[PDB]
């Protein structure tokens, strides 16, 4: 329905075709198809807020040219 941008790990921007009703886990599955990163290892940041699983894109007011930032988890302890 709308086409959003994702900035990948190397800074390169890819495009995704999504719905406002799309869940976050659905978007992570779409990113895995283009980047090869499992959804459990993905973190998506929109406007400074991490997107939590189970919510939809409409919950975060994500519009057409919205940009998601893709980062991983660097675990430590």
């Amino acid at each position: 329905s709308m086409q959003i941008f994702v900035k990948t790990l190397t800074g390169k921007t890819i495009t995704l075709e999504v719905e406002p009703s799309d869940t976050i886990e659905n978007v992570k599955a779409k990113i895995q198809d283009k980047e090869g990163i499992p959804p459990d290892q993905q973190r998506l940041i929109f406007a400074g807020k991490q997107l939590e699983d189970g919510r939809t894109l409409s919950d975060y007011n994500i519009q057409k040219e919205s940009t998601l930032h893709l980062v991983l988890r660097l675990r430590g302890g």
């Binding site: 190397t10 890819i14 519009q63 988890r73 660097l74 302890g77």
Partner: protein, 312 residues
Amino acid sequence: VGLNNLGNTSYLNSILQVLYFCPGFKSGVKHLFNIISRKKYELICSLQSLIISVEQLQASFLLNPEKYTDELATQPRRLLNTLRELNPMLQHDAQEVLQCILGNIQETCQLLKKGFELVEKLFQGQLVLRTRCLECESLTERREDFQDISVPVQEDMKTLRWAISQFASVERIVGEDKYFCENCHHYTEAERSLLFDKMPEVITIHLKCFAASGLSKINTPLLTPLKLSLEEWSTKPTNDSYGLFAVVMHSGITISSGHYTASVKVTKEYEGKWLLFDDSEVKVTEEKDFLNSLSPSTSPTSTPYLLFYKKL
């Protein structure tokens, strides 16, 4: 000593060590704590207890170093209890912990409002994202807030300026990532560029020191400068420059486990030095010596992960 258990929450400790030395963060926490006290909220209450605990330790460290070691071991259980309550999260990501703490404080401020803008004034900026269709050359703009800047560390010795250019310079999206232009009603190649409009007091650089082929950690750091200017990617000409004051590093060969350490700058004799926090150990360091340790030419074992720059 008995403070050895500090290591387990090194993801939280590094973030709280950075926030303690941020300019205006502990003043903002006290202001919120005062408001909540006469309002009669646990995040603010436990943060103020932590700040007072560290303030007592810091004061003792300055005045009587011999009794600092005694007082640090006198009541270590008290310090460890407030960190268990303050933990917003296993081994975790330091940037994710910082995002949780700053989000919790922001929600408290918004609910208290209905001085209250601690997070927004300190860590929140505004981006202008431009897209230019290469067929019709029409410009579309998006405005998005940001709290930290995620830059790459390798191309797929490099400086931080190269990394920000990969973030904000004009990028051409082609091939499988063609932009859909509403004006053309067609898929077209486009150029995307990011610009900084509103500038927070503290600039956080999130270094993507990790890659995918399968996920691996990149151990080579960038050439981190002491001075940072964002005029190259700003909407308006600004003479404001930024100075490095805190670094969070990750030690480990993998992304699934490791250790977090934080280096902060004192802003007396200690003013102008760098404090290296390693679990229960604190070392005072010269600015010249710390910057050499950051050099990728020396192959550091601690990989810089978060850089913090304050407006000058």
